[PDB]
Amino acid sequence: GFNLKVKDLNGSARGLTQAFAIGELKNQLSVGALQLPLQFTRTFSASMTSE
Amino acid sequence: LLWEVGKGNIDPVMYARLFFQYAQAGGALSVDELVNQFTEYHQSTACNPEI
């Protein structure tokens, strides 16, 4: 329920970011070299519960 | 052959043949290389989409 202001996460939940996902301090998040379509569209994932 | 280009659409051969004409021409030889260059060229195409 973290309420957050668009045009910031890099502060707003600072490190809850794609940037963060790099680590990436608060640089980039940009465009656009190369570009490259993939949509691997499946995952392997699980399900609820393990208790 | 003649090979008028008017509606280019794959079919290498011709092209290749031109390539050879170049290849032969010594204005291509490492024609191959050129394709690399080209690959890169292409690639750069890949790289400038935004452009």
Curated annotation (Swiss-Prot), chain B:
> Which gene underlies this protein?
P1
Instruction: Please list the disulfide bridges.
Output: none
Please give the subunit comment from the record: Homodimer. Associates with the polymerase complex.
The name on file for this protein is: Major inner protein P1
- Signal peptide positions (record): none
Where does this protein reside within or beyond the cell? Virion
Q: Which residues form a coiled coil?
A: none
TM stretches of this protein: none
Q: What does this protein do?
A: P1 is the major inner capsid (core) protein of the polyhedral procapsid, which is responsible for genomic replication and transcription. Forms a dodecahedral shell from 60 asymmetric dimers. Binds to RNA and may be involved in genomic packaging.
* Portion held of the full protein: 52 to 102 of 769
